[PDB]
Amino acid sequence: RYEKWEKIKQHYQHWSDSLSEEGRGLLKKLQIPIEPKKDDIIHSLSQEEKELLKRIQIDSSDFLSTEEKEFLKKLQIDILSEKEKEFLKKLKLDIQPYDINQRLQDTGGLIDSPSINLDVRKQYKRDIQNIDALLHQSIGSTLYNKIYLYENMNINNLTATLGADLVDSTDNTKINRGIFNEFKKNFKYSISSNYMIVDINERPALDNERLKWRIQLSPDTRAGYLENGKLILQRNIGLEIKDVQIIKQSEKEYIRIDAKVVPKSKIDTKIQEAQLNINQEWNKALGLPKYTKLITFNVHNRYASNIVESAYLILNEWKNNIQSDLIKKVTNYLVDGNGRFVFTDITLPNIAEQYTHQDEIYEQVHSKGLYVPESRSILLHGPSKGVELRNDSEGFIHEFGHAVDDYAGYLLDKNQSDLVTNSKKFIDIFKEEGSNLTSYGRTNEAEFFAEAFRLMHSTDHAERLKVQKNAPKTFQFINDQIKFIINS
Ligand SMILES: [Zn+2]
């Protein structure tokens, strides 16, 4: 336990001793993000703004992250709501901690992405570059194969959908074995785009970490010793999943993920190869040009290979549950406008198909999926879970729902290009039936249309018919639009 710790510490002793006080300080900033002083913020608001705060329906919002909704309610006592909505969007940017590792993960390493304030984006960049320069020493071709490094990870870091049910509610010290097989089904490779911080000695799991990574470095892998038995690894490395098993540790159940370090490029190629292949296959199915670029894989993080394989099922479910003609027509419209199906594990404000059309950061959105009319693209973010969605496949259909809206209004006026949900016919339909479907459907016309579209294509046919009953005017309006599109 302490031998191999001592052997690593020595190997890195010259390196450690050589650390500037400024560099030693940087590695601390990295491990411990600089949270916002709760006081430092409230002393920025105006007297008018203070009012709107202490009395807004906070703990139950649309965009309010759990870490955000808590940190925020932590301030309402230092003293929905639609004009508090545009207020919140702005306030959400001024309270994010300064968390380098998070910045790398959100952006997939594309730190230049215009998704935060320029001067803060530059700070991150200065720090990330400094750390790269700090981490110059390989593990060396002697230690790499005689030691194991360990990481404990929360399952929700990799897929929030499948992590909600990875533990039996039956028995919470055992793992549901079905969800295991499809977690491990297509888990072949991984990508760290930030700095992995790993233990020299396997550490006992804490509250919600049921994944116990056991990792084997390569001779070239660059790393640095951190006090108390840890290593910090250079970012941008690839991991080949070598064995995913269920092990037992002190009469609870865990997942052993065995991984080897390999060049990020080896995986990037694999992803590139896959992205080619899936366009090949779906260009044929849609009768689009052999070489058309419709599907994009934007993949940079730890459940890499699954994002890829997931996209195949999502696209299969799309073809199974939606008339062939509706699909072919609408996709041809998206490609007519250089559109994209984008499957990704970086957050959505860091997807170019979104950020180049929304300059203001306070109006950039992250969530399970998105449609961007200005770039005619569907963005689907693998790792998270949308509220009220069974699987990632359903969320897609919701977004295609948005593109169906798009084509329908283009076809009303090729000149006055607009959304059908902005035609007064559907606007009126919404004020009646707008509250009869999903709770989220009540948000606005467009979303109501999308959710209705979604439900109207469930594999659960009870749900399909519940739309005809509770919102028959919405139902007919949609199927109309469909019939409309199929006729060129
Ligand atoms: Zn939507």
Residue corresponding to tokens 């995986």: 267
In angstroms, the CA 377 to CA 344 distance is 13
Which residues are part of a known binding site?
398, 402, 440, 447
Dist. CA 165 → ligand 1 center (Å)? 25
Domain coverage including residue 382: 264-488
Contact present, 213 and 245 (Cβ < 8 Å): no
- Domain's final residue, options 96, 116, 131: 96
Q: Could you tell me which residues are beta bridge partners of residue 379?
A: 342, 370
C-to-N gaps above 2.5 Å in the chain, after residues: 79
Q: Please check whether residues 234 and 325 belong to one and the same domain.
A: no
In angstroms, the CA 346 to CA 417 distance is 31
Q: Could you tell me which residues are beta bridge partners of residue 230?
A: 199, 226
Q: Could you tell me which residues are beta bridge partners of residue 239?
A: 190, 261
Q: Please check whether residues 101 and 221 belong to one and the same domain.
A: yes
User: Quick count: other Cβ atoms within 10 Å of Cβ 487?
Assistant: 9
Q: Please check whether residues 164 and 296 belong to one and the same domain.
A: no
Instruction: Fill in the DSSP letter of residue 188.
Output: -
Query: 165 by DSSP, 3-state: which?
Result: coil
Q: Please check whether residues 165 and 177 belong to one and the same domain.
A: yes
In angstroms, the CA 190 to CA 73 distance is 36
- Closest by CA to 406, choosing from 476, 486, 481, is 481
Query: 79 by DSSP, 3-state: which?
Result: coil
Dihedral angle over CA of 248, 254, 258, 263, nearest 10: -170
Residues 6+ apart with CB under 8 A from 155: 162, 163, 166, 183, 210, 211, 255
In angstroms, the CA 418 to CA 404 distance is 12
Token digits of residue 384: 């998270």
Token digits of residue 325: 């003609």
Dist. CA 361 → ligand 1 center (Å)? 19
- Closest by CA to 164, choosing from 363, 405, 387, 407, is 387
For residue 218, count CB atoms less than 10 angstroms from its CB and return exposed for 0-12, middle for 13-18, buried for 19 or more. middle
C-alpha to C-alpha distances, 224 to 217, 260, 302, nearest whole angstrom: 13, 18, 21
Dist. CA 447 → ligand 1 center (Å)? 5
Instruction: Fill in the DSSP letter of residue 155.
Output: G
Q: How was this structure determined?
A: X-ray
- Domain's final residue, options 263, 294, 323: 263
Contact present, 234 and 195 (Cβ < 8 Å): yes
Contact present, 378 and 403 (Cβ < 8 Å): yes
Instruction: Fill in the DSSP letter of residue 154.
Output: -
Contact present, 126 and 23 (Cβ < 8 Å): no
In angstroms, the CA 196 to CA 390 distance is 31
| Count of domains for the chain | 3
Residue corresponding to tokens 């230092």: 78
Q: Please check whether residues 108 and 91 belong to one and the same domain.
A: no
Q: Please check whether residues 268 and 121 belong to one and the same domain.
A: no
Dist. CA 201 → ligand 1 center (Å)? 45
Strand positions, DSSP E, 143-288: 149-153, 189-192, 197-199, 211-216, 223-226, 230-233, 237-248, 253-262
Q: For position 64, which CATH number holds?
A: 1.10.2030.10
Q: Please check whether residues 130 and 89 belong to one and the same domain.
A: no
Q: For position 298, which CATH number holds?
A: 3.40.390.10
CA atoms within 13 A on the CB side of 317: 19
Q: Please check whether residues 253 and 314 belong to one and the same domain.
A: no
Query: What are all long-range contacts of 288-296, with beta carbons under 8 Å and residues at least 24 apart?
Result: 288/331, 288/332, 288/335, 292/335, 293/340, 294/331, 294/334, 294/335, 294/339, 294/340, 294/341, 295/340, 295/341, 295/342, 295/343, 296/340, 296/341, 296/342, 296/343, 296/344, 296/353
Q: Please check whether residues 320 and 379 belong to one and the same domain.
A: yes
Q: Please check whether residues 471 and 325 belong to one and the same domain.
A: yes
Contact present, 378 and 132 (Cβ < 8 Å): no
Dist. CA 187 → ligand 1 center (Å)? 29
- Sheet harboring 340-344: ordered strands across? 295-298, 340-344, 377-381, 369-372
Contact present, 259 and 239 (Cβ < 8 Å): yes
- Domain's final residue, options 230, 263, 296: 263
Residues 6+ apart with CB under 8 A from 55: none
Dist. CA 370 → ligand 1 center (Å)? 6
Q: Please check whether residues 295 and 421 belong to one and the same domain.
A: yes
Contact present, 409 and 446 (Cβ < 8 Å): no
In angstroms, the CA 28 to CA 39 distance is 23
Residue corresponding to tokens 């934007």: 298
Q: Give the DSSP letter string of 264-280.
A: HHHHHHHHHHHHHHHHH
Q: Please check whether residues 294 and 408 belong to one and the same domain.
A: yes
Token digits of residue 60: 């139950």
Dist. CA 401 → ligand 1 center (Å)? 8
In angstroms, the CA 468 to CA 476 distance is 8
Catalytic residues: 399
Q: For position 257, which CATH number holds?
A: 3.90.176.10
Which residues are part of a known binding site for Zn(2+)?
398, 402, 440, 447
CA atoms within 13 A on the CB side of 362: 11
